[PDB]
Design a protein around this nucleic acid. Structure first.
Lengths: 124, 54, 100, 47, 113
RNA sequence: GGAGGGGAGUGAAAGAGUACCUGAAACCGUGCGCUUACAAUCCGUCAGAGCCCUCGACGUGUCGUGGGGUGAUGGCGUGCCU
């Protein structure tokens, strides 16, 4: 039985070419170049899914730092005071409060300042 | 010297778009009554019946 | 008024009538569940003490169990010949918050 | 009643033939021979 | 809009050379396009003018449209079959020569003044 | 001028016209949408404004467990094989 290769190959070629819509130049037209770019794209996506959590945490920390310095307190002392006070709001919702409900953020800053020690540089 | 690399489509098209023709300007003229368009460079010749109008 | 509820290792800011995607819970659609709270913001005063947060809970109704976006994984290392294709679809539940 | 389509081999009777040089999934680009040398091309006599 | 079409196929000009001339008469009235092609100093203007005139005649005759209201709506040139020749060169090598043709499609349509 | 085409006919079909079954890809056009002329780009990926299209709900535009196209802008990122 002589077997022609067309159907089996066309299947995966169509899959790869469809996945490469929107690419520039050869990378969206030719199957080989599109396949190379697909390897790179999936590697990039895998790496970026891991890095995205850190990126968003960095953005939240930036916003919380801005809103805390607006209340005359630094981010690190505010985090220490919030941990001491036992409140368990994470940085995502802390930034959400900072942007959407400034009064709530000010109240949390007040409780964090209350929970802080009297001399932060003491050998405690 | 020989081309080291194959041109991308963008560069080829951007250079190729410069190979074009300009439209000659046309002015009206009355030959044997009927109005028709003619280049200004040939206005006098048309008025003298020296240019073939189809 | 709104609260910050904890479920599945994560926290979400929800108000009454909010619809939020959440990690899978072992509850049938149309049922109701109660969730712990990490902060309550009612009007102006903010509830932050642990005991007061323990005295309150947020009740929500399970709308459906859905699936996350399809994720395609293709691990690759050049000059090696190593490839590893893998897919994943996370399971999720959709909760509508009934009240706080 | 046993028909012609009820006949099956015994469990473990048949084993799939392994086809080498058919991509990096199973045994690719080398068919299990390693890199170059005498043994990567023909063979070595027993004696 | 009512319209009529005409096609010249296997015209023995390359598609790019025809496009150079076609790019002069797009969206223009049939009479002004015919004048432009009459005075264009390119060899490809004769086939294109013939296609446009044929389309205008089709519009006037078969659909009974007013010639004064005709406009060159759509016009393009495609590639036809290309024949392969050989030009002998220095030191015994032979090169390939391509004899390209083109198909020209024109669509005129009636538009209000 | 022909070539070729448009009507008209034949045909079940002319998206069967003696360049003729089916008619893929590379390659070449035309039209529409988004974008692009202060900008150093393995050309993707992750966030993402704006614009356009579409499915639901309530009014007249405004959200949603929405979906698609394009993407200014920011982060990361040294092609495949041997």
């Amino acid at each position: 039985a002589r077997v022609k290769r067309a159907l089996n190959a066309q299947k995966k070629r169509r899959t790869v070419l469809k996945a490469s819509k929107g690419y520039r130049g050869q990378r969206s037209r030719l199957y080989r170049k599109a396949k190379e770019q697909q390897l790179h794209s999936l590697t990039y996506a895998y790496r970026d899914r891991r890095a995205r959590k850190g990126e968003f945490r960095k953005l939240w920390i930036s916003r919380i730092n801005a809103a805390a310095r607006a209340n005359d307190i630094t981010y690190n002392r505010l985090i220490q005071g919030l941990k001491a006070a036992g409140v368990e709001v994470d940085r995502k919702n802390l930034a959400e409060l900072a942007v959407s409900d400034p009064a709530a953020f000010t109240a949390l800053v007040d409780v964090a300042r209350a929970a802080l020690p009297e001399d932060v540089n003491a050998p405690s | 010297a020989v081309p080291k690399r194959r041109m991308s489509r963008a560069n080829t098209r951007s250079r190729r778009a410069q190979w074009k023709a300009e439209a000659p300007g046309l002015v009206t003229v009355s030959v044997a009554g009927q109005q028709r368009k003619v280049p200004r460079r040939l206005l006098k010749a048309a008025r003298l019946g020296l240019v073939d109008l189809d | 008024t709104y609260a910050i509820v904890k479920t599945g290792g994560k926290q979400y800011k929800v108000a009454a009538g909010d619809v939020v995607k959440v990690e899978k819970l072992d509850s049938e659609p149309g049922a109701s569940v109660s969730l712990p709270v990490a902060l309550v913001v009612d009007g102006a005063n903010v509830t932050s003490k642990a005991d007061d947060l323990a005295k309150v809970a947020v009740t929500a109704e399970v709308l459906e169990h859905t699936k996350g976006p399809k994720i395609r994984i293709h691990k690759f290392k050049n000059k090696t010949g190593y490839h590893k294709r893998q897919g994943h679809r996370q399971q999720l539940t959709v909760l509508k918050v009934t009240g706080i | 009643v046993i028909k012609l389509h009820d006949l099956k081999p015994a469990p473990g009777e048949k084993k799939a033939k392994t086809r080498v040089g058919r991509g990096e999934g199973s045994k690719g680009k080398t068919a299990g021979r390693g890199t170059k040398g005498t043994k990567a091309r023909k063979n070595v006599p027993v004696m | 809009f009512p319209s009529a079409t005409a096609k010249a196929r296997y015209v023995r000009v390359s598609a790019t050379k025809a496009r150079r001339v076609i790019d002069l008469v797009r969206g223009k009235s049939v009479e002004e396009a015919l004048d432009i092609l009459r005075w264009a100093p390119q060899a490809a203007s004769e086939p294109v003018a013939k296609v446009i005139a044929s389309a205008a005649a089709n519009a006037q005759n078969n659909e009974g449209l007013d010639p004064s209201t005709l406009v060159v709506a759509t016009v393009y040139a495609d590639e036809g079959p290309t024949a392969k020749r050989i030009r002998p060169r220095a030191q015994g090598r032979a090169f390939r020569i391509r004899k390209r043709t083109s198909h020209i499609t024109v669509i005129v349509e009636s538009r209000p003044p």
